[PDB]
């Protein structure tokens, strides 16, 4: 409400007397104000759900994609402008193929998230990314912060209402959750933040399963899932 | 601000010692005041009027260390043209090149503009040439000019004295008169430095030659 | 009082008075540091420093303020240790370059001048802050006798028969002045240096200190080395008895 | 015209007829259509014409008729219209005029909300901006009058609301939360205390008048003033450290300190002592010191509610002594203002001996007497710090081609500040403290040689200040040494011919010239020595060294020929009293009394005027005879000789302008004709001119016209001589011993000192003696400067035609200077411009 | 405005930082006098050893730029050493590039040109030092030249630097105006008398340091304390 | 209101002869969670307490591998720690390639000190905000080292860094004499006890929140996490 400014805030590369870097903290918070994205990781599969928020009927819905395929086994959900994450998504895609050429093998999600973090370190970066894929360990989900910290999350929500979604996610999530149950829960949580009827344009749903590659649900496939709710 | 820095640089030139240039049909005369502050200073050690090439010479009003940087660049530019075209550089060409260097210092950041205004005399194609270059990098062609303290008063005095057809000898006398108007004390051969440009080329008048001209006046 | 003009902010600025404040401020950092004492004897130079032990948890020999910058030359430092360690690295490099290019050990007086110029370079530019350390370089050779030089944050280097850098610089200097370094051998000097360090140290202000002693001399065959522990223990016993 | 007309109607509004309000309402009530533009015209006329200054008995005839309608429109109009600003101004005037006759409380919550809305402070994440909110612009000045007017009375609603406004916006006052809102918030902080102090003065210390008095019931109680200071003190203290600069906070503190010193002075002092000590927080020192100047009058003389009072003054002055330094100009200037303000308020005399000899002193007074012992240490230390500033202020020319020969505005300001502060310290100093100071200045100036351009001028000013405080002793040490050094150096006789004089000779000539200005009677004892020095020095060829000698002649002539006040002291006839006859601690602070000011005035004596005429005959007349010969075809002289002679004449005219009578001539025949007389005003201004002696101004005029004719005809290129002739023609036409420019600077300085040292609550009745002496001198200067109705005359016409000839000269520099003098002359003589136009 | 903080033009047209650099030369508190005689050039500077502990040999303001060229440095000592190293490098480079020893006038110009760069560029502060170079020019005889922080250089019959430079220049001007060409003994006497008069020290041999170059022996020589004493004792008996 | 003109840059020196930005950076380590490192005659052990964003989140990794014989624990900005860790790994690999010798731990800590010093003396550079506890085994023996944002490094018998580190340091100093002769199991237990002192009374050490790394004469640096920490955790007595 009322302004609460301190001399050491907004100092760029200057440590505050406490030792915190305030300008970096403010930048990271602004980055996390994008559209809500929910990822839940289950033994059966990892599911990523995002809100498209298309402005006009004329616009083609496919052109706005918040879920992208880094590789057959890895997919990324982003909150905020696609343009901000374009360089980071490209780095991950180039690294996954560069790794394949050098070692003739798939790159684990943790190694892929570390490479994107290294680019972010080499500077806030302006995006929060959820990387979900099935690797040698199994189905795995990682969260990348605008700061560049990466942690494995059983269930994570990034975006404007992430804090509320995360509390809802905590109560619903259980280790034995099936992929079909996870899809329903993430969409139910997404509906609560959106406060809008779920439709194919409103939400984009993608899943990576151990046998299957990255799959983005088609309009008909999403419609069946939303109707069951 | 770069433009304000140029105005401030012009002020330093105005505070500088008076210098006079007169262009006559057979030659250009460049004259400057060189009053040593003390009897201790050696008059012959440093020269305000310097040759750039056989036919080109320059004088300045303003900061002397800044003037030296320009004279080295001007001498280099003259040599670079001579190597490529095997002919003495046209004076107008040299002034354009010298002006560009001054513009570079004003445009760049972290460097102050030069505080010296240059009067350049040259003889090419049997025609006398006199030019003035500003810290801004602007150059103008002048039949007669005065720079430094009391430049405005000196320029008006030049207007009455200057005649379109004048011999160099007469031009030297009026140039000395212009310096005399703003000279605080007695003028002596050591006190004033005079340089003449003619078909022969730029030469600094020897103190003995200056003494003769002063006696006539 | 305090100056808000901003003349004191950079070492690329001169105050209207004519002084570069940043070099003066850096010297104050050396003054707020444990005293380091160097005394030059006919045989050679002995350096003694009081190294405050901040914590019992730290191992002995941590945060050494005595460094070997060459086989024949050793350095005693005061002020910020990290800056002093950086200066030691430059001094070792200059000595290595001199040996490779000219084929002989760098003469102390030339090492001091080369290092002093590097410290001076920091004092003239906006981007780099002046060094916050002052050091004494000491060496001995048959051709050139014991040499002691002190370089300040400004970069002025002079040769001293006796020198002190730190909080008790004046107190140490007065104690060194009442001595006959020119006619005294190095072994006698070590006992005196320990005595001077004990007197300068303030127990109430600084709870604990470890005396670090190094010498380069005819006895060490022109090699900078820590004074042997047995000799150091004897000197400490003499110093403690003298303080009583 | 609009502003003059608005003030004229406002001036006649108190004296308008009783039934005027009803007729005014009938005239502009039809125009009041809210949609139409005529509503603004109707409100504008109502603000300018409706009379609020009507007696309480005739209130029904005026304010009662329209208050309900206009106030009702103001509450009803939620959109902010242009007229609302005019309407709020009218309400504020009505509230201040009728303090206890209007209820105000029903509308108080709405007014405070609208004023809070006016500040346009940002609140909330959205922070959307609505157009026309800026346009309403409730003025802070009128709003402050409205809030102060409704304050007081049985109801405390206004005070509670004011606390609420201050409590709501406190975060904005914090230095870190700076922004666009600060300008209005700072204005509120400065204006509100000033309004309250003015209201209390009207209620308590103002003489009764026809204007209705505040009702006793609605008069502000002591508790009401206590509540107001408590509400505004916390915002003011944050504003002291504001990035904007703290001028608004210092003014607010000055007014608050008069109302309640105990509540406001200690929090500022708690910050000031650390600010002096801190090395890492520079901004605090300037802000705290400026606030201490504001509360200075209250702390030194206020003991009833602030018993510690003056005890803090001596430690603060010593702590501020490191503040004078070459490195920081702003700290040096604020320190100089601090040292001067306290020094003028406090007699600097030691009374430590009194404690032992006499008991019955108050406990605070006993501490004050013990503190007085350190006063001598403070003055000597101030001189030591000042000597360092002068030593590091050397010009040090770095250009081989030219010498700067000039003072930058920043160095001029430090010289002015050092001279003023040193003069105040010495004037308040006891003679015993002064004598140790005199030796210190004499030794420093005598021991070293200084560059005349900058450092030498500062040393001379310190020496000149010492001479003024006690002239007989100071001149006795300074005049012989300077004269002896000059005579020994000039004995060669080739010195006169030499160009570039000995630096020691140049310094001693500057020192002798500056020390010369002082009471004329004191100069007479050394009259013979001064004339001998002038005779050798005036004709020195070097331009510097004849200028310094000419300055000596001007100062000597000015000192003996002008009326000026010598003492300039805080206590009349004080500081030389026998010990125990007068007790200084009682006179700390203490305003001077106009009736008992006892100003000592130097009026030119017969001996002084005779010496001035002898000097004019000895130097001006020989130059005049040579100049007359040069105007004729005789005694051809060099351009340098003409310039030297013109310098001698110009300095003589300036020095003796008061003595020389105004130019007189037959009036120009053709002029506008008036049946009524058109006579120039005559003011005595002291002195009385000598009719028998020939007027030098007339002889200068004839030679100057002849020289001008010769110079333009022959040496038209002599610009330096022509500039001097223009100055001489201006002095001949309009100089009576006072310079208009000098008066303007002194008037501005008087206003600047007055603001800091004025107690609004007690009024002009309490004012410092030094400022009062300055105001009397300003009145004398006003009389000499004001000349009106002067006849054009033939002599003036010829000089103006000569100015026009110079104004059309070949050299632009001569033309510019002549034109400024030409424009000045045209205004002085009646109907002069019409004659000049052809 | 940063006009005072960095070397950029002021409204008056003056660069304050160069003026502040001139103040730095006086901050050292030492004065140097150089006089040019008919056959020789001499430099005298006051040497003060504050502590008995300091080795006297190490503290010097007189340096050898080249075999025939020597200099006196007045000002910040570390800045002085920096200029001395630059001058020595420039002299060696000139002999390598052109095959003849650098003239003293040319060396003063090179150092002065480096000094101008500092005045033009904001990042580097001007060096607060004065260099007085003495050498014998084969063509023009003994030469004394002085370099300034402003980048100005000039040849002088006699010159002074330091706290007493203004007073020293005044004493030197009177002797130069009168008198005649001076012999080596007279030139050394003039410098010692000038420094003694301004500082009122009655210098013992240890207090003053003297450097000399002669037409007969062009190489720069620093006089030993005994040689300085011989000049001092001769001055006392006069 | 109390603004300091000298704290803006690492280059500026205060009139009191202190560089404020370096001191502010030194405080950054205290922001990070507590880490305890102690050594015996044959083994060096680092024990650290990790913290997690949420119950679902895995927990941040305090301990990292630098070489077979060298391991480090990070307190303070993680990004700075990753830059330092990458530098340390390159130096160690270079030493094995050029000399086929494990890089002595003392030489590595000196190189970190040199790298950290350059940001302190140069404009527009923030000093590193990470404090590192380094555990290594070399010919000299097991070594524990502490690095600071100031660029100073310390050889420590035992050290604790991070929030509430002082409580651990008081335990480490009290029982330091016992540490030299302790067996690996006892040495790890002592480190867990010191870390326990930092923990608030309500919170207790768990397999999820504790990370242990041990290097020894015959043991390459090994990081024990989750179930691996359970054998060490079971032995520890209940909180006093």
DSSP for D273-306, please give it.
HHHHH-SS-HHHHHHHHHHHHHTHHHHHH--SS-
> Which residue on chain C is closest to D281 by alpha carbon?
C2
> Which residue on chain C is closest to D329 by alpha carbon?
C5
Helices (H), D120-214: 133-136, 140-150, 157-168, 170-173, 182-200
Distance of CA C214 to the CA centre of its chain: 11
Token pair listed for E197? 């008069």
Contacts of D753 (CB under 8 A, 6+ apart): D771, D774
The distance of F41 to chain A (nearest Cα, Å) reads 36
DSSP-derived letter for residue D586 is G
Contacts of A5 in chain F (CB under 8 A): none
In order of D668, D701, D799, D802, E204, the CA distances from D836 in angstroms are 12, 20, 12, 12, 78
In order of D88, D112, D140, D141, D196, the CA distances from D146 in angstroms are 8, 10, 10, 9, 11
Query: What is the side-by-side order of every strand in the sheet holding E129-137?
Result: E62-66, E69-75, E129-137, E141-147, E153-155
The widest CA-to-CA distance across chain F, in whole angstroms, is: 59
Are F and D neighbours with ≥3 CB pairs closer than 8 A? yes
Query: What is the side-by-side order of every strand in the sheet holding C209-217?
Result: C162-165, C36-40, C44-52, C209-217, C225-226
Residue A177, domain CATH:
3.60.20.10
- ∠ Cα A102 A108 A112 (to 5°): 80
Question: Does D282 lie at the interface with C, CB-CB under 8 angstroms?
Answer: yes
Contacts of E51 in chain C (CB under 8 A): 160, 173
The resolution, in Å, is 3.1
Any idea where the domains of chain E sit in the sequence? 1-238
| CA atoms B204, B210, B214, B215: torsion sign | negative
Taking CB atoms and an 8 Å limit, are A5 and D176 in contact across chains?
Answer: yes
Token pair listed for C211? 């005396």
Question: Does D398 lie at the interface with C, CB-CB under 8 angstroms?
Answer: no
Residue A7 forms part of a structural domain: no
Q: Which of F210, F163, F194, F199 is nearest to F52 (CA)?
A: F210
Residue identified by tokens 């003409």 is D642
> Which residue on chain E is closest to B68 by alpha carbon?
E113
Residue identified by tokens 């405390």 is D156
* Interface test with chain C among F10, F17, F165, by most C beta carbons within 10 Å: F17
Residue D225 buriedness (CB in 10 A; 0-12 / 13-18 / 19+) = buried
Subunits in contact with chain F (3 or more CB pairs closer than 8 Å): A, C, D
Question: Does E158 lie at the interface with B, CB-CB under 8 angstroms?
Answer: yes
Are F and C neighbours with ≥3 CB pairs closer than 8 A? yes
The distance of A9 to chain D (nearest Cα, Å) reads 10
* Interface test with chain D among F1, F4, F16, F23, by most D beta carbons within 10 Å: F1
Residue A10 forms part of a structural domain: no
Residue E52 buriedness (CB in 10 A; 0-12 / 13-18 / 19+) = exposed
Distance of CA F72 to the CA centre of its chain: 6
Question: Does E76 lie at the interface with C, CB-CB under 8 angstroms?
Answer: yes
In order of D377, D380, E110, the CA distances from D384 in angstroms are 11, 6, 42
What is the span of the domain harbouring residue A217? 22-228
* Interface test with chain E among D398, D448, D495, by most E beta carbons within 10 Å: D398
Taking CB atoms and an 8 Å limit, are D171 and A1 in contact across chains?
Answer: no
Nearest to C116 among E6, E78, E124 (CB): E78
Question: Does E1 lie at the interface with D, CB-CB under 8 angstroms?
Answer: no
Are D and C neighbours with ≥3 CB pairs closer than 8 A? yes
* Interface test with chain F among D171, D280, D330, by most F beta carbons within 10 Å: D280
Question: Does C127 lie at the interface with F, CB-CB under 8 angstroms?
Answer: yes
The distance of E63 to chain C (nearest Cα, Å) reads 14
Q: Which of C85, C66, C86, C63 is nearest to C75 (CA)?
A: C66
Nearest to D279 among F1, F2, F16 (CB): F16
Tell me which residues of chain E, numbers 92 to 131, contact chain B at a CB-CB cutoff of 8 Å.
105, 109, 112-113, 115-116, 119-123
Distance of CA D151 to the CA centre of its chain: 35
Any idea where the domains of chain C sit in the sequence? 1-244
Are B and F neighbours with ≥3 CB pairs closer than 8 A? no
- ∠ Cα D296 D297 D299 (to 5°): 65
Taking CB atoms and an 8 Å limit, are D177 and A6 in contact across chains?
Answer: no
Contact yes or no for C4/D282 (Cβ under 8 A): yes
Contacts of E123 in chain B (CB under 8 A): 110
Q: How far apart are CA F189 and CA F47, in angstroms?
A: 10
The distance of B161 to chain E (nearest Cα, Å) reads 31
Question: Does D304 lie at the interface with E, CB-CB under 8 angstroms?
Answer: no
Residue A17 forms part of a structural domain: no
The distance in angstroms from the start CA to the end CA of chain F is 46
- Interface B–E counts its CB contacts (< 8 A) at 88
The distance of D182 to chain E (nearest Cα, Å) reads 24
Q: How far apart are CA D109 and CA D157, in angstroms?
A: 9
* Interface test with chain B among D401, D408, D501, by most B beta carbons within 10 Å: D401
> Which residue on chain F is closest to A144 by alpha carbon?
F57
Q: Which of D506, D419, D403, D428 is nearest to D459 (CA)?
A: D419
Any idea where the domains of chain B sit in the sequence? 1-217
- ∠ Cα E119 E125 E129 (to 5°): 85
The distance of D734 to chain B (nearest Cα, Å) reads 29
Contacts of A104 (CB under 8 A, 6+ apart): none
Within 10 A of B32 (CB to CB), how many other CB atoms are there? 26
Contacts of D127 (CB under 8 A, 6+ apart): none
Taking CB atoms and an 8 Å limit, are D280 and F1 in contact across chains?
Answer: no
Q: Which of D567, D579, D599 is nearest to D349 (CA)?
A: D579
Contacts of D399 in chain B (CB under 8 A): 15, 63
Are D and E neighbours with ≥3 CB pairs closer than 8 A? yes
Q: How far apart are CA B108 and CA E137, in angstroms?
A: 41
In order of A225, D189, D263, E231, the CA distances from D230 in angstroms are 67, 13, 8, 80
Residue A188 forms part of a structural domain: yes
Taking CB atoms and an 8 Å limit, are E148 and D449 in contact across chains?
Answer: no
How many CA atoms are closer than 13 Å to the CA of C49, on its beta-carbon side? Answer: 27
Helices (H), D429-540: 431-447, 455-469, 471-490, 503-516, 520-525, 527-538
- Give the DSSP letter string of A185-210: HHHHHHHHHHTS---TTTEEEEEE-S
Residues of A with CB under 8 A from a CB of F: 7, 11, 13-21, 117-118, 121, 143, 147-149, 151-156, 166, 169-170, 173
Kindly report the backbone phi and psi dihedral angles of residue C224, in degrees, each rounded to the nearest multiple of 5, phi listed first.
-70, 130
Q: How far apart are CA D525 and CA D530, in angstroms?
A: 10
Taking CB atoms and an 8 Å limit, are F3 and D175 in contact across chains?
Answer: yes
Q: Helix D543-561 and helix D639-655: axis angle, to 10°?
A: 20
Nearest to D171 among A3, A6, A7 (CB): A3
Q: How far apart are CA C48 and CA C46, in angstroms?
A: 7
Taking CB atoms and an 8 Å limit, are D172 and A6 in contact across chains?
Answer: no
Q: How far apart are CA A50 and CA A55, in angstroms?
A: 16
> Which residue on chain D is closest to F12 by alpha carbon?
D280
Q: Which of D507, D501, D394 is nearest to E163 (CA)?
A: D394
H/E element, C38 = strand C36-40
| Count of all residues that appear for chain F in the document | 240
Token pair listed for A93? 């895609």
Residue A118 forms part of a structural domain: yes
Taking CB atoms and an 8 Å limit, are A153 and F57 in contact across chains?
Answer: yes
Question: Does D404 lie at the interface with E, CB-CB under 8 angstroms?
Answer: yes
The distance of C22 to chain D (nearest Cα, Å) reads 14
Tell me which residues of chain F, numbers 96 to 125, contact chain C at a CB-CB cutoff of 8 Å.
110, 113-114, 116-117, 120-123
> Which residue on chain A is closest to D126 by alpha carbon?
A1
The distance of C101 to chain E (nearest Cα, Å) reads 17
């Amino acid at each position: 409400m009322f302004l609460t400014r301190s001399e050491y805030d907004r100092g760029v590369n200057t440590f505050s007397p406490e030792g915190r870097l305030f300008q970096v903290e403010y930048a990271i918070e602004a980055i996390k104000l994008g559209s809500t994205a929910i990822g839940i990781q289950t033994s059966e599969g990892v599911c990523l759900a995002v809100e498209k928020r298309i402005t006009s009927p004329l616009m083609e819905p496919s052109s706005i994609e918040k879920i992208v395929e880094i590789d057959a086994h890895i997919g990324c959900a982003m909150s905020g402008l696609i343009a901000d994450a374009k360089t980071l998504i490209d780095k991950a895609r180039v690294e996954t193929q560069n790794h394949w050429f050098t070692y003739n093998e798939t790159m684990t999600v943790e190694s892929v998230t570390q490479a994107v973090s290294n680019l972010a370190l080499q500077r806030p970066f302006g995006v929060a990314l959820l990387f979900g894929g099935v690797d040698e360990k199994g189905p795995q989900l990682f969260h990348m912060d605008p700061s560049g910290t990466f942690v494995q999350c059983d269930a994570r929500a990034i975006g404007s209402a992430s804090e509320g979604a995360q509390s809802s996610l905590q109560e619903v999530y259980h280790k034995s959750m099936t992929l079909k149950e996870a899809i329903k829960s993430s969409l139910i949580i997404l509906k609560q933040v959106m406060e809008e009827k779920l439709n194919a344009t409103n939400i984009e749903l993608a899943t990576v399963q151990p046998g299957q590659n990255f799959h983005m649900f088609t309009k008909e496939e999403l419609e069946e899932v939303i109707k069951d709710i | 601000g770069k433009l304000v820095q140029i105005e401030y640089a012009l002020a330093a030139v105005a505070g500088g010692a008076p210098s006079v240039g007169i262009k006559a049909a057979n030659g250009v005369v460049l004259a400057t005041e060189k009053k040593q502050k003390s009897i201790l200073y050696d008059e012959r050690s440093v020269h305000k009027v310097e040759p750039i090439t056989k036919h080109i010479g320059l004088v300045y009003s303003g900061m002397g260390p800044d003037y030296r940087v320009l004279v080295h660049r001007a001498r280099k530019l003259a040599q670079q043209y001579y190597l490529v075209y095997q002919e003495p550089i046209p004076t107008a060409q040299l002034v354009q090149r010298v002006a560009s260097v001054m513009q570079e210092y004003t445009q760049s950041g972290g460097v102050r503009p030069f505080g010296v205004s240059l009067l350049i005399c040259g003889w090419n194609e049997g025609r006398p040439y006199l030019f003035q270059s500003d810290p801004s990098g602007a150059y103008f062609a002048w039949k007669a000019t005065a720079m430094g303290k009391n430049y405005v008063n000196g320029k008006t005095f030049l207007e009455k004295r200057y005649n379109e057809d004048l011999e160099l000898e007469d031009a030297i006398h009026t140039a000395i008169l212009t310096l005399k108007e703003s000279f605080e004390g007695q003028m002596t051969e050591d006190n004033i430095e005079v340089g003449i440009c003619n078909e022969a080329g730029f030469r600094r008048l020897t103190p003995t030659e200056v003494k003769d001209y002063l006696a006539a006046i | 009082s305090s100056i808000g003009t901003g003349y004191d902010l950079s070492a690329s600025t001169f105050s209207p008075d004519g002084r570069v404040f940043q070099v003066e401020y850096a010297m104050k950092a050396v003054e707020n540091s444990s005293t380091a004492i160097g005394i030059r004897c006919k045989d050679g130079v002995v350096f003694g420093v009081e190294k405050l032990v901040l914590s019992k948890l730290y191992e002995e020999g941590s945060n050494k303020r005595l460094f070997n910058v060459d086989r024949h030359v050793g350095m005693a430092v005061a002020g910020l240790l990290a800056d002093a360690r950086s200066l030691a690295d430059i001094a070792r490099e200059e000595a290595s370059n001199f040996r490779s290019n000219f084929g002989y050990n760098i003469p102390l007086k030339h090492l001091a001048d080369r290092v002093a110029m590097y410290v001076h370079a920091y004092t003239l530019y906006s981007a780099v802050r002046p060094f916050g350390c002052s050091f004494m370089l000491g060496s001995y050779s048959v051709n050139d006798g014991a040499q002691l030089y002190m370089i300040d944050p400004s970069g002025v280097s002079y040769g001293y028969w006796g020198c002190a850098i730190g909080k008790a610089r004046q107190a140490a200097k007065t104690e060194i002045e009442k001595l006959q370094m020119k006619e005294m051998t190095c072994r006698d000097i070590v006992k005196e240096v320990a005595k001077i360090i004990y007197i300068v140290h303030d127990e109430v202000k600084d709870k604990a200190f470890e005396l670090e002693l190094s010498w380069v001399g005819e006895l060490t065959n022109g090699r900078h080395e820590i004074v042997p522990k047995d000799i150091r223990e004897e000197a400490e016993k003499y110093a403690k008895e003298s303080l009583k | 015209v609009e502003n003059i007309l608005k003030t004229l109607v406002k001036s006649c509004r108190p004296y308008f007829p009783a039934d005027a309000t009803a007729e005014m309402l009938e005239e502009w009530r039809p125009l009041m259509c809210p949609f139409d533009v005529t509503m603004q015209k109707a409100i504008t006329y109502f603000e300018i014409f409706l009379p609020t200054s009507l007696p309480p008995e005739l209130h029904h005839k005026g304010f009662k008729l329209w208050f309900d309608e206009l106030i009702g429109l103001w509450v009803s109009v939620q959109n902010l219209p242009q007229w609302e600003g005019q309407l709020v101004n009218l309400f504020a005037r009505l509230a201040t005029d009728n303090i206890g006759y209007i209820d105000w409380d029903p509308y108080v919550p709405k007014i405070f909300t609208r004023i809070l809305r006016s500040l346009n402070l940002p609140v909330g994440s959205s922070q959307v901006l609505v157009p026309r909110f800026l346009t309403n612009a409730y003025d802070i000045g009128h709003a402050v009058i409205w809030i102060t007017a409704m304050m007081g009375g049985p109801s405390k609603l206004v005070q509670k609301h004011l606390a609420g406004l201050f409590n709501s916006i406190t975060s904005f006052y914090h230095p870190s939360n700076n922004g666009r809102w600060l300008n209005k918030l700072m204005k509120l902080l400065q204006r509100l205390p000033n309004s309250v102090v003015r209201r209390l003065h009207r209620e308590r210390y103002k003489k009764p008048s026809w204007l209705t008095p505040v009702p006793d019931s609605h008069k502000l109680t002591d508790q009401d003033v206590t509540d107001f200071v408590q509400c505004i003190i916390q915002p003011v203290l944050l504003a002291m450290f504001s990035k904007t600069g703290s001028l608004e906070a210092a003014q607010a503190l000055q007014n608050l300190a008069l109302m309640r010193p105990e509540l406001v002075i200690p929090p500022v002092l708690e910050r000031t002592y650390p600010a002096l000590e801190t090395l890492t927080e520079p901004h605090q020192l300037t802000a705290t010191l400026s606030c201490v100047i504001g509360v200075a009058r209250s702390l030194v003389s206020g003991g009833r509610w602030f018993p510690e009072g003056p005890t803090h003054m001596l430690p603060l002055l010593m702590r501020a002594l490191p503040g004078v330094d070459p490195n920081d100009f702003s700290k040096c200037m604020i320190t100089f203002q601090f040292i001067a303000t306290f020094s003028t308020l406090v007699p600097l005399v030691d009374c430590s001996s009194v404690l032992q000899e006499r008991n019955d002193l108050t406990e605070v007074e006993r501490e004050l007497c013990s503190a007085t012992a350190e006063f001598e240490d403070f003055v000597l230390q101030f001189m030591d710090r000042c000597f360092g500033l002068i030593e590091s202020s050397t010009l040090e020319q770095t250009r081989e081609e030219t010498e700067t020969e000039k003072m930058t505005h920043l160095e001029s300001l430090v010289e002015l500040g050092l001279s003023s502060t040193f003069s105040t310290i010495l004037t308040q100093c006891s003679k015993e403290i002064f004598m140790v100071a005199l030796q210190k200045v004499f030794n420093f100036s005598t021991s070293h040689i200084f560059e005349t351009r900058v450092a030498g001028r500062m040393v001379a000013d310190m020496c000149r200040a010492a001479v003024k405080c006690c002239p007989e002793e100071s001149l006795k040490l300074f005049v012989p040494h300077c004269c002896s050094v000059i005579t020994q150096l000039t004995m060669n006789d080739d010195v006169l011919n030499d160009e570039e004089l000995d630096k020691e000779l140049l310094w001693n000539l500057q020192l002798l010239s500056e020390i010369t200005r002082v009471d004329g009677r004191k100069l007479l004892l050394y009259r013979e020595q001064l004339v001998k020095i002038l005779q050798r020095t005036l004709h020195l060829t070097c331009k510097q060294g004849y200028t310094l000698s000419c300055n000596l002649l001007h100062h000597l002539l000015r000192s003996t020929t002008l009326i000026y006040p010598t003492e300039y002291c805080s206590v009349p006839g004080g500081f030389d009293k026998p010990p125990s006859e007068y007790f200084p601690i009682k006179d700390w602070g203490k305003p001077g009394d106009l009736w008992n000011l006892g100003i000592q005035w130097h009026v030119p004596s017969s001996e002084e005027v005779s010496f001035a005429f002898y000097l004019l005959d000895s130097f001006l007349q020989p130059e005049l005879v040579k100049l007359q010969h040069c105007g004729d075809g005789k005694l051809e002289m060099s351009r340098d000789d003409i310039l030297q002679s013109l310098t001698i004449v110009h300095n003589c005219i300036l020095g003796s302008g008061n003595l020389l009578p105004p130019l007189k001539g037959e009036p120009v025949t053709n002029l506008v004709p008036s049946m009524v007389s058109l006579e120039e005003t005559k003011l005595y201004t002291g002195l009385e001119y000598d009719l028998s002696r020939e007027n030098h101004r007339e002889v200068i005029a004839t030679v100057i016209r002849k020289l001008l004719n010769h110079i333009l005809d022959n040496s038209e290129d002599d610009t330096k001589s022509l500039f001097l002739i223009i100055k001489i023609i201006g002095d001949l036409l309009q100089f009576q011993g006072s310079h208009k420019h000098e008066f303007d600077s002194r008037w501005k300085s008087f206003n600047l000192v007055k603001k800091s040292m004025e107690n609004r609550l007690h009024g002009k009745k309490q004012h410092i003696r030094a400022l009062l002496i300055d105001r009397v001198m300003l009145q004398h200067e006003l009389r000499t400067l004001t000349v009106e109705g002067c006849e054009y005359k033939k002599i003036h016409q010829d000089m103006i035609r000569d100015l026009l000839r110079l104004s059309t000269s070949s050299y632009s520099q001569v033309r510019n200077k002549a034109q400024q003098t030409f424009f000045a002359a045209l205004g002085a003589y009646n109907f002069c411009c019409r004659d000049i136009i052809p | 405005g940063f006009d005072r903080h960095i070397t950029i033009f002021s409204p008056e047209g003056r660069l304050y930082q160069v003026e502040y650099a001139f103040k730095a030369i006086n901050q050292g508190g030492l004065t140097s006098v150089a006089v040019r005689g008919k056959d020789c050039a001499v430099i005298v500077t006051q040497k003060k050893v504050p502590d008995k502990l300091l080795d006297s040999s190490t503290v010097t303001h007189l340096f050898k730029i080249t075999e025939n060229i020597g200099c006196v440095m007045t000002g910040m000592t570390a800045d002085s050493r920096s200029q001395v190293q630059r001058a020595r490098y420039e002299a060696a480079n000139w002999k390598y590039k052109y095959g003849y020893e650098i003239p003293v006038d040319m060396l003063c110009k090179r150092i002065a040109d480096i000094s101008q760069v500092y005045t033009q560029n904001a990042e580097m502060r001007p060096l607060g030092c004065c260099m007085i170079l003495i050498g014998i020019d084969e063509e023009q005889g003994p030469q004394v030249y002085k370099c300034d922080p402003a980048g100005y250089y000039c040849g002088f019959k006699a010159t002074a630097a330091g706290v007493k430079q203004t007073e020293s220049t005044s004493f030197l001007e009177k002797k130069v105006k009168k008198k005649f060409d001076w012999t080596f003994e007279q030139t050394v006497e003039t410098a010692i008398t000038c420094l003694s008069t301004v500082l009122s020290i009655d210098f013992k041999p240890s207090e003053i340091e003297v450097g000399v170059v002669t037409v007969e022996n062009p190489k720069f020589r620093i006089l030993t304390e005994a040689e300085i004493d011989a000049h001092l004792v001769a001055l006392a008996e006069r | 209101m109390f603004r300091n003109q000298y704290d803006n840059d690492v280059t500026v020196w205060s009139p009191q002869g202190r560089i404020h930005q370096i001191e502010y950076a030194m405080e950054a380590v205290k922001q990070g969670s507590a880490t305890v490192g102690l050594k015996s005659k044959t083994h060096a052990v680092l024990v650290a307490l990790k913290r997690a964003q949420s119950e679902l989140a895995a927990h941040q990794k305090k301990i990292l591998h630098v070489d077979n014989h060298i391991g480090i624990s990070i307190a303070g900005l993680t990004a700075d720690a990753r830059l330092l860790c990458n530098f340390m790994r390159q130096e160690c690999l270079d030493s094995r390639f050029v000399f086929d010798r494990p890089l002595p731990v003392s030489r590595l800590v000196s190189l970190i000190g040199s790298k950290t010093q350059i940001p302190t003396q140069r404009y527009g550079r923030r000093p590193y905000g990470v404090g590192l506890l380094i555990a290594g085994y070399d010919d000299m023996g097991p070594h524990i080292f502490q690095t600071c944002p100031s660029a100073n490094y310390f050889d420590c018998r035992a050290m604790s860094i991070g929030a509430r580190s002082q409580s651990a340091r008081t335990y480490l100093e009290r029982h330091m004499s016992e540490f030299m002769e302790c067996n690996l199991n006892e040495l790890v237990k002592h480190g867990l006890r010191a870390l326990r002192e930092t923990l608030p009374a309500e919170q207790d050490l768990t397999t999820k929140n504790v990370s242990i790394g041990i290097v020894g004469k015959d043991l390459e640096f090994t990081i024990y996490d989750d179930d691996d920490v359970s054998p060490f955790l079971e032995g520890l007595e209940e909180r006093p």
